[PDB]
Coordinates of C-alpha atoms in Angstrom, one line a residue:
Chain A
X1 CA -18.5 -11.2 -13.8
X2 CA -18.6 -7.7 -15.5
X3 CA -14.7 -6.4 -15.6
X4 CA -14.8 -2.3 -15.2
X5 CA -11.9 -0.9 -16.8
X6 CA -10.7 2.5 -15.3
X7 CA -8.6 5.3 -17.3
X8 CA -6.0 6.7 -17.5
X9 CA -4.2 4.5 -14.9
X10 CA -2.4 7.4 -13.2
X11 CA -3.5 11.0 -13.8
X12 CA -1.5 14.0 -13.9
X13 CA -2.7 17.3 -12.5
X14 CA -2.3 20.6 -10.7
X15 CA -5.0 21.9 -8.1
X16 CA -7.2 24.0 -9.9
X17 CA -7.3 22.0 -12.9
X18 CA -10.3 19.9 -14.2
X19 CA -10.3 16.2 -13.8
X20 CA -12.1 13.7 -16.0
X21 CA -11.4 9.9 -14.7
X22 CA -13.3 7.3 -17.1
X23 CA -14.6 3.8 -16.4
X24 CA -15.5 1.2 -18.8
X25 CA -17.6 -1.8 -18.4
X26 CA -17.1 -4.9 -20.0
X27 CA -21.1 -4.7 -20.2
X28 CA -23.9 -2.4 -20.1
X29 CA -24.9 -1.3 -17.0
X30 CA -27.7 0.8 -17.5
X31 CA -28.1 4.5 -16.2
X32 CA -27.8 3.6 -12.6
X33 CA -26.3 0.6 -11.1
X34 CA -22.5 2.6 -11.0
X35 CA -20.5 4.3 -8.0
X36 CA -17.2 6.1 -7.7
X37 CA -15.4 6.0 -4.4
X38 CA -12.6 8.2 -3.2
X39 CA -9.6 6.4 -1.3
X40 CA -6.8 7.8 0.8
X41 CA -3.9 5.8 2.2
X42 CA -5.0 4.0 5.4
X43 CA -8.6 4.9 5.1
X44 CA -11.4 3.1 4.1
X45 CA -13.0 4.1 1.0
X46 CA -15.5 7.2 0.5
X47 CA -18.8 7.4 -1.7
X48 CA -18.5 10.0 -4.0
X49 CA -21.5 9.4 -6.5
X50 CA -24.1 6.5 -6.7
X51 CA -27.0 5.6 -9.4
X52 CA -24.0 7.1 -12.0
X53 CA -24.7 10.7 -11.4
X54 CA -25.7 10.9 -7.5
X55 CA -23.8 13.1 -5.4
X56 CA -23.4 11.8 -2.1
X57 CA -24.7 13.2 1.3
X58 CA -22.2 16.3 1.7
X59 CA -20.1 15.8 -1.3
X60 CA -19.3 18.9 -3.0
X61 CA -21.0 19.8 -5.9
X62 CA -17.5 20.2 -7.6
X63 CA -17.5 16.4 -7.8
X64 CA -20.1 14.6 -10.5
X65 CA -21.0 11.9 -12.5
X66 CA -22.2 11.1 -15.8
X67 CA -22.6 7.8 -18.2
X68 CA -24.3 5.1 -19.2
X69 CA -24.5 1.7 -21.0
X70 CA -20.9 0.6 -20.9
X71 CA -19.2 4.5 -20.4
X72 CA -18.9 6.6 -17.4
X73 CA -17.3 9.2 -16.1
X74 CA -16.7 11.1 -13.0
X75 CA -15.5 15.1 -13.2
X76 CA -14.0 17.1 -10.7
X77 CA -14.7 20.9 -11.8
X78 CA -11.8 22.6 -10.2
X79 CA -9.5 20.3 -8.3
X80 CA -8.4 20.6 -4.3
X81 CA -5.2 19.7 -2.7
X82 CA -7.1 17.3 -0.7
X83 CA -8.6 15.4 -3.9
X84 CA -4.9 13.8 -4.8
X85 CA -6.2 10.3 -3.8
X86 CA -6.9 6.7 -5.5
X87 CA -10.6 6.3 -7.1
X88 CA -12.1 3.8 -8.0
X89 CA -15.7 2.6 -9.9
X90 CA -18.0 0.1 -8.4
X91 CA -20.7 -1.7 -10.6
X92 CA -23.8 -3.1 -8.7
X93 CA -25.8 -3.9 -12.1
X94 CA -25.3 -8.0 -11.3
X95 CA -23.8 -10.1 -8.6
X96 CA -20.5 -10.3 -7.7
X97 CA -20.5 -6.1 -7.7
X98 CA -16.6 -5.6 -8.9
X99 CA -14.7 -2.3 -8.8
X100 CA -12.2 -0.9 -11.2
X101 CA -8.4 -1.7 -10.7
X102 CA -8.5 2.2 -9.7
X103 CA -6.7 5.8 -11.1
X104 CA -3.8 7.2 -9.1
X105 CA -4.7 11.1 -9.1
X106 CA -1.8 12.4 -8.2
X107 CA -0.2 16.1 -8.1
X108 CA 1.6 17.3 -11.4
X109 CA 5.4 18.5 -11.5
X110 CA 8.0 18.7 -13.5
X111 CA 10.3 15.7 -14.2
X112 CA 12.8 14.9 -11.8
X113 CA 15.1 12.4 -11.8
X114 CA 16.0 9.4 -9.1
X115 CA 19.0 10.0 -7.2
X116 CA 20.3 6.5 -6.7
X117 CA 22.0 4.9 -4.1
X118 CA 23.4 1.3 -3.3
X119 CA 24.0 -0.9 -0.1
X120 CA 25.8 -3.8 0.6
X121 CA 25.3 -5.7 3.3
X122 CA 26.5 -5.4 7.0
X123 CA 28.8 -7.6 8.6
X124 CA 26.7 -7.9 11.3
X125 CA 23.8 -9.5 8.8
X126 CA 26.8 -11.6 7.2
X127 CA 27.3 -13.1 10.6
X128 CA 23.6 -14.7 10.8
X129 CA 23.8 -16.3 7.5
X130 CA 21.8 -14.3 5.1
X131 CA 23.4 -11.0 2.8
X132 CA 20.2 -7.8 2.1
X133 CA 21.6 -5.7 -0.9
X134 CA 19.3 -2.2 -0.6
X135 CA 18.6 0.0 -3.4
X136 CA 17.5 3.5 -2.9
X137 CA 16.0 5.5 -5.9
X138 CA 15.0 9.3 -3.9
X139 CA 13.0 11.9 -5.1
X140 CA 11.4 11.4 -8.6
X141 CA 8.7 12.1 -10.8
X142 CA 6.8 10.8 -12.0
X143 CA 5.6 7.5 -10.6
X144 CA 6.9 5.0 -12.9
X145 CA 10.3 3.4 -12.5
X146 CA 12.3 0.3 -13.0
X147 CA 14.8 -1.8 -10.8
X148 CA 16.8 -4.3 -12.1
X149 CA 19.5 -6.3 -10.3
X150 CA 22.4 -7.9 -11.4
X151 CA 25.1 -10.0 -9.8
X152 CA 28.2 -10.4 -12.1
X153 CA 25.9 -9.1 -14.8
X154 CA 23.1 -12.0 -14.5
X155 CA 19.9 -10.1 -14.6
X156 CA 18.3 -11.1 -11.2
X157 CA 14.6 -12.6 -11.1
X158 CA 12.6 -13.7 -7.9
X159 CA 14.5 -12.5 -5.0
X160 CA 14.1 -9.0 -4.9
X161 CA 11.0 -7.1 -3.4
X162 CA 10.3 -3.3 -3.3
X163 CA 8.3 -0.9 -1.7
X164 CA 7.2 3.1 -2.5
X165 CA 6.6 5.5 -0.2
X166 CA 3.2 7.7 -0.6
X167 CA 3.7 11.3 -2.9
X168 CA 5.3 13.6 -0.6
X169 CA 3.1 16.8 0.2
X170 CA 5.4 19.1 -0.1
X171 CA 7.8 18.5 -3.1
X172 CA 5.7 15.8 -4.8
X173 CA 8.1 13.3 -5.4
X174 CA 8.3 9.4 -5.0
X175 CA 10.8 7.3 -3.6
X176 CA 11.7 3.7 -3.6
X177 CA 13.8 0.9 -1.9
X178 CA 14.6 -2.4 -3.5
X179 CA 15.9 -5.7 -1.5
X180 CA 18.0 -8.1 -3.0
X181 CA 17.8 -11.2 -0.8
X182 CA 20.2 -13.9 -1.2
X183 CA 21.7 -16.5 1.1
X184 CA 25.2 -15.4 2.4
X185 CA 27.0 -18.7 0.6
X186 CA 25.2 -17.4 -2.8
X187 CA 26.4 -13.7 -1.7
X188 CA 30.2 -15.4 -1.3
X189 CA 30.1 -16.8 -4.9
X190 CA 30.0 -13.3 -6.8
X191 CA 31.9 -9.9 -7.2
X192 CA 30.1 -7.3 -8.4
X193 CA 26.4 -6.2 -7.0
X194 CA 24.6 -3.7 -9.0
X195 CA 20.8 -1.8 -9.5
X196 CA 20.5 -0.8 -12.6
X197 CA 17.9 2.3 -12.9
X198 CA 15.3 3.1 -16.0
X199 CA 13.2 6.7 -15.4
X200 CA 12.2 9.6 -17.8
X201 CA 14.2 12.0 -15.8
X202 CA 17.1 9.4 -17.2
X203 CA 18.4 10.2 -20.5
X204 CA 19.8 6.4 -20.2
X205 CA 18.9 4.2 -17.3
X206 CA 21.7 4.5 -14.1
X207 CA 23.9 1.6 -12.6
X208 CA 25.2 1.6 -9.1
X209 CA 27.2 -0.9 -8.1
X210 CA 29.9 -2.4 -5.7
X211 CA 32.4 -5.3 -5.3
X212 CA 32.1 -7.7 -2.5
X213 CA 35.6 -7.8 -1.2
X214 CA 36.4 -3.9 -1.2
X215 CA 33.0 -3.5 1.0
Chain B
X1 CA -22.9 9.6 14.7
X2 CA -23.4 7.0 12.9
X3 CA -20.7 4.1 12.8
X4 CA -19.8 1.1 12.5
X5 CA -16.8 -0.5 14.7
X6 CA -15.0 -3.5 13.2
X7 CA -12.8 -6.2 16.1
X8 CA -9.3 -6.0 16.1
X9 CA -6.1 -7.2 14.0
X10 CA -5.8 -10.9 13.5
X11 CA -3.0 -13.5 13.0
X12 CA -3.5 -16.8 11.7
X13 CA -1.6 -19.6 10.3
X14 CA -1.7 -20.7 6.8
X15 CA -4.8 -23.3 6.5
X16 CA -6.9 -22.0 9.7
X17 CA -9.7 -19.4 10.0
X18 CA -10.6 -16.0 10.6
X19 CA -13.5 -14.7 12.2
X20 CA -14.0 -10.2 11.9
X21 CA -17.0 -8.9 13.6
X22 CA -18.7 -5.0 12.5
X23 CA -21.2 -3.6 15.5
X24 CA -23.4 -0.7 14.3
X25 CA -24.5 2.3 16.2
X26 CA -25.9 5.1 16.4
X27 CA -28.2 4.3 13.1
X28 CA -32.0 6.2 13.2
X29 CA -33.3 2.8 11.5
X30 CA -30.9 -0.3 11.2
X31 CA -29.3 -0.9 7.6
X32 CA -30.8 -3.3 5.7
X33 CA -28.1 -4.7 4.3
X34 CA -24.6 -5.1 5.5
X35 CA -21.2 -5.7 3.1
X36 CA -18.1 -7.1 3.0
X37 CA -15.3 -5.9 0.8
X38 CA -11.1 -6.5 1.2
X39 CA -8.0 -5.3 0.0
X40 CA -4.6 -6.7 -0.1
X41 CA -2.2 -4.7 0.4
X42 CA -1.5 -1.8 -2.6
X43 CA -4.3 -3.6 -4.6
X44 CA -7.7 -2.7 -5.5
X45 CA -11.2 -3.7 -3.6
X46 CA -12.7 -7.0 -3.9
X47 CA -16.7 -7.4 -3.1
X48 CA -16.8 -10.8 -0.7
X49 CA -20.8 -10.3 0.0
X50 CA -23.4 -9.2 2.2
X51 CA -25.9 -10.1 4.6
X52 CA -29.4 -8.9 5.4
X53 CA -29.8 -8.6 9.3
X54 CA -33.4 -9.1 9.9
X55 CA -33.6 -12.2 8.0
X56 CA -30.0 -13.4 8.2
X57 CA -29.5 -13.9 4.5
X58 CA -26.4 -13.5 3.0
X59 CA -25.2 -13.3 -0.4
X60 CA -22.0 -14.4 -2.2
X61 CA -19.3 -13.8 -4.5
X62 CA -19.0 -17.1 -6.1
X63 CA -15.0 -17.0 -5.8
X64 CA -15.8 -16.7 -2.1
X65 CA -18.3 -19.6 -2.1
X66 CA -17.9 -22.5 0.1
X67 CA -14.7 -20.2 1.9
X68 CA -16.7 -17.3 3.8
X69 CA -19.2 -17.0 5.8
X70 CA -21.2 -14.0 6.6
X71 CA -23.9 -13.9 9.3
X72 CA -25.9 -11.0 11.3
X73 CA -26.9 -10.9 15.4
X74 CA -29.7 -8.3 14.5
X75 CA -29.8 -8.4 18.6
X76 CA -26.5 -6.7 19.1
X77 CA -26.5 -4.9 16.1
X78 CA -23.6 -7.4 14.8
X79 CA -22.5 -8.8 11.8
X80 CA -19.4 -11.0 11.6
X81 CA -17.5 -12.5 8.2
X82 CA -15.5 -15.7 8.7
X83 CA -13.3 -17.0 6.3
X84 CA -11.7 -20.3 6.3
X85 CA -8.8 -22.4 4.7
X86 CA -6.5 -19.5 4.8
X87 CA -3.9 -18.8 2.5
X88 CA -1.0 -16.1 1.5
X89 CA -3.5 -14.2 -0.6
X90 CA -6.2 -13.4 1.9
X91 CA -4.0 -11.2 4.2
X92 CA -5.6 -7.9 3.6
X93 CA -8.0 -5.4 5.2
X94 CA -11.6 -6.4 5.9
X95 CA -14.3 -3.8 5.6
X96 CA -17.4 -4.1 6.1
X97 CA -19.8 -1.2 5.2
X98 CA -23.7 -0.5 5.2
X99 CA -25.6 0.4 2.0
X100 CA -27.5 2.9 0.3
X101 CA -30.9 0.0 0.6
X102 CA -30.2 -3.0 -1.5
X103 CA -28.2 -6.3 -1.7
X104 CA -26.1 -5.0 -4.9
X105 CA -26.2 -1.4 -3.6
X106 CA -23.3 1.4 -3.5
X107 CA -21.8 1.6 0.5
X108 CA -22.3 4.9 2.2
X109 CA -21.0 3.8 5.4
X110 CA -17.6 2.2 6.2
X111 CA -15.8 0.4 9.2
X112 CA -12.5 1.0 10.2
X113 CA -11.2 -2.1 8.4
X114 CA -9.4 -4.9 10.1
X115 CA -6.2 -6.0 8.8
X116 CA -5.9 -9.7 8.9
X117 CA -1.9 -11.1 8.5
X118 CA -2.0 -14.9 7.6
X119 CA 1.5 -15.8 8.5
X120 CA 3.2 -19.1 10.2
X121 CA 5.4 -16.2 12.6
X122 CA 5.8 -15.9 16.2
X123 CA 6.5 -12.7 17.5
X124 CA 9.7 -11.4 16.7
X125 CA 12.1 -8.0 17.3
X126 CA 13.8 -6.9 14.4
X127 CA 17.5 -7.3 13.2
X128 CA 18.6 -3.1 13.0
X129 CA 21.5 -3.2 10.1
X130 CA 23.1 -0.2 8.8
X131 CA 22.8 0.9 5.2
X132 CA 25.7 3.2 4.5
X133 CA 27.5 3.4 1.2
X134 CA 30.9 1.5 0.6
X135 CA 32.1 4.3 -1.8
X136 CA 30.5 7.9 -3.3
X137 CA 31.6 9.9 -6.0
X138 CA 32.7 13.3 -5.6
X139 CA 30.1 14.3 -8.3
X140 CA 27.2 13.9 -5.6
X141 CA 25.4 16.9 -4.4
X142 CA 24.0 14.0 -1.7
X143 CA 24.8 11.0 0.3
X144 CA 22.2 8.7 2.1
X145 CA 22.4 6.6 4.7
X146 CA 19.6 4.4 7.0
X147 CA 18.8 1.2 8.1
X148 CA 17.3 -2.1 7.4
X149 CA 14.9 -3.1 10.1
X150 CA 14.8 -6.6 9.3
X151 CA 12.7 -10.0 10.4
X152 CA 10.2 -8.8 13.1
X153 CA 6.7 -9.6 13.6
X154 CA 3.7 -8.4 13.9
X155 CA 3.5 -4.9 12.4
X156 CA 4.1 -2.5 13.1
X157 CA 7.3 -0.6 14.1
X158 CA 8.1 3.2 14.9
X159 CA 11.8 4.4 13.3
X160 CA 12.9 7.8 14.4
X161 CA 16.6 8.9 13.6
X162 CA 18.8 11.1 15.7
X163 CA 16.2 10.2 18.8
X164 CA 13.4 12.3 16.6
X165 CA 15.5 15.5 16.4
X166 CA 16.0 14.6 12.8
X167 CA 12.8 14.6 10.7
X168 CA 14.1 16.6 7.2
X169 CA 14.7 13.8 4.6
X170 CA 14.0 11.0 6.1
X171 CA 11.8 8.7 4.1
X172 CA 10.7 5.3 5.6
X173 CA 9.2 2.6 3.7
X174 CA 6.3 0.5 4.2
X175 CA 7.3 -3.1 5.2
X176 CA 7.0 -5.9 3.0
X177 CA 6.2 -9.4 4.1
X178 CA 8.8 -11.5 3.2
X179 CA 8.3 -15.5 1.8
X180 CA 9.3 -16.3 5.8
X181 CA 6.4 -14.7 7.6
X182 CA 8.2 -11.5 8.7
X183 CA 8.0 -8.0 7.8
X184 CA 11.3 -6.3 6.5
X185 CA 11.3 -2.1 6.1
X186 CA 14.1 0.4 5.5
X187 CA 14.0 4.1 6.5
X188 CA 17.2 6.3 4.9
X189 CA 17.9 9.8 5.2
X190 CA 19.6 11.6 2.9
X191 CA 22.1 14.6 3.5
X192 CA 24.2 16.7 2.0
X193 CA 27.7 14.8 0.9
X194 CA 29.3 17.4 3.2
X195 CA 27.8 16.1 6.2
X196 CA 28.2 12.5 5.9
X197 CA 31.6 11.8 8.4
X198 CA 31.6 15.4 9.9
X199 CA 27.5 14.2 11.5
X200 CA 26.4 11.8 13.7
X201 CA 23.1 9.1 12.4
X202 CA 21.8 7.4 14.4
X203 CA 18.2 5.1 14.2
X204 CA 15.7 4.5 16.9
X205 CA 13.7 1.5 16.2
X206 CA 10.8 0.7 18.4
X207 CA 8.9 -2.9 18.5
X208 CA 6.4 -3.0 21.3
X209 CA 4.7 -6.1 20.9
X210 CA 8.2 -7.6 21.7
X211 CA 9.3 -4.9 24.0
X212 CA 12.3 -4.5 21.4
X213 CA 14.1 -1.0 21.5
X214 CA 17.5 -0.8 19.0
X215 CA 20.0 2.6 18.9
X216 CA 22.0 1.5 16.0
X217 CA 24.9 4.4 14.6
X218 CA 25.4 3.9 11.2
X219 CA 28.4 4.6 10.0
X220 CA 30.3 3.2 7.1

């Protein structure tokens, strides 16, 4: 199948601004057989451009699209607050059609670091048999981030899943919660429970942490 | 207006089958061509195929093959996308959407999606568990506290703190689905350090399909 390639992966920007989003294919596709969509969270997908430079029916002309052979690109002249979305390429040169992995256009602001929390688990959880370590990283920017867990200082792999919530609309930030899932007998072998935090708003990554037994 | 209206969200276990259907209206001249494309959760959109009502011929992704099958009632303006030997990595939204003319085509048009949850769960309220800290330093501006809304199925469920009266700083996550079959979310708020033992915080979760509704005061 032809791979599409989008870039950059997340891009930066302030309404107003000018936005160039780029998609490479792994082969030529001609002049045509290229779309870009537009894609907010919990909506379908929107056509933006089709045969590469195509606007849409009722697309604004502030959207458009040029390329060919293996290089496109799609340009928004003058960005709008409602244009902070995911898009994403489509190529329809061969069979299977295959899209790009998509670019996060999100709202530029200055850097702001996590504020980090950490939670151990309730006794009521303790009870049923099974200890949920939370933690909270609010507020930042940009995007990017990295959890890691330790327990006694062993760098935990495998049982830990995370979730971010959407940019917020008003202050642009991030936020994101981590779950550290261990049985309660594994929970009662160890001391110290900690999230260790990396971010650019970090001038070294941040540790919270707590001992089992004092909470 | 034109539109197409996909069937509603579907459970299955792992190893069964899914059938979506897509009904079309309000169309001046019927789409040749109708398509199928999904997306897991947070990824990115995967073409499955199409189908051409008039004839009933569909066309594949080959890593889709053998799995899914796409058909067309050109009477009821219908198309439906089944997909078999279910697994883990096929819980996702299924769109379908109409095209610009052709087979391999851009999609103009777009369903609702149906979201499709392959999981071995029964229905299930959710665990409430506080999330407050054990210590905080007196170098911090802000405090947070919430709660872990944990083990429930199906999606989805509605967390308001403070009965809804507070709104300001409240961020709640989307679930994940855990290794088990059940969804596990957390909502905090955060506050100034100031008011964290002079307030009261309390969340509302709300799980209809089990008729589940949890006050729980989180406090240290």
């Amino acid at each position: 199948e032809t791979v599409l390639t989008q870039s950059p992966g997340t891009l930066s920007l302030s309404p107003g601004e000018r936005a160039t989003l780029s998609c490479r294919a792994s082969q030529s596709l001609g002049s045509s057989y290229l779309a870009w969509y537009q894609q907010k969270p919990g909506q379908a997908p929107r056509l933006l451009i089709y045969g590469a430079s195509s606007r849409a029916p009722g697309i604004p002309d502030r959207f458009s699209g040029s390329g060919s052979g293996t290089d496109f690109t799609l340009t928004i002249s003058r960005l709008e607050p409602e244009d902070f979305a995911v898009y994403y390429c489509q190529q329809y040169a061969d069979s299977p059609i295959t899209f790009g992995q998509g670019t996060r256009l999100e709202i530029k602001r200055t850097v702001a670091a996590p504020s980090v929390f950490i939670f151990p688990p309730s006794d009521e959880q303790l009870k049923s048999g099974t200890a949920s370590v939370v933690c909270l990283l609010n507020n930042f920017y940009p995007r990017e981030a990295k959890v890691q867990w330790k327990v006694d200082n062993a760098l935990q792999s495998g049982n830990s899943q995370e979730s971010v919530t959407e940019q917020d609309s008003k202050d642009s930030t991030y936020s994101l919660s981590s779950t550290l899932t261990l049985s309660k007998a594994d929970y009662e072998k160890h001391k110290v429970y900690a999230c260790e935090v990396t971010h650019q708003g970090l001038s070294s990554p941040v540790t919270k942490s707590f001992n089992r037994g004092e909470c | 207006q034109v539109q197409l209206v996909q069937s509603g969200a579907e459970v299955k276990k792992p190893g069964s089958s899914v059938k979506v259907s897509c009904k079309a209206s309000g169309y001046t001249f019927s789409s040749n061509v109708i398509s199928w494309v999904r997306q897991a959760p947070g990824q990115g959109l995967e073409w499955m195929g199409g189908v051409i009502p008039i004839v009933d011929i569909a066309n594949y992704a080959q890593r889709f093959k053998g799995r899914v099958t796409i058909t067309a009632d050109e009477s009821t303006s219908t198309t439906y996308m089944e997909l078999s030997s279910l697994r883990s990595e096929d819980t996702a939204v299924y769109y379908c959407a109409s095209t610009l003319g052709l087979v391999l085509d851009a999609m103009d048009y777009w369903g609702q999606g149906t979201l499709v949850t392959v999981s071995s769960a029964s229905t299930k309220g959710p665990s409430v568990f506080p999330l407050a800290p054990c210590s905080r330093s007196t170098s911090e501006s802000t405090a947070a506290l919430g709660c872990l809304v944990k083990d429930y199925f199906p999606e989805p469920v509605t967390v308001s703190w403070n009965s809804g009266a507070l709104t300001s700083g409240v961020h709640t996550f989307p679930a994940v689905l855990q290794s088990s079959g059940l969804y596990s979310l957390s909502s905090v708020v955060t506050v100034p350090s100031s008011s964290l033992g002079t307030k009261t915080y309390t969340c509302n979760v709300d799980h209809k399909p089990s008729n589940t509704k949890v006050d729980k005061r989180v406090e240290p």
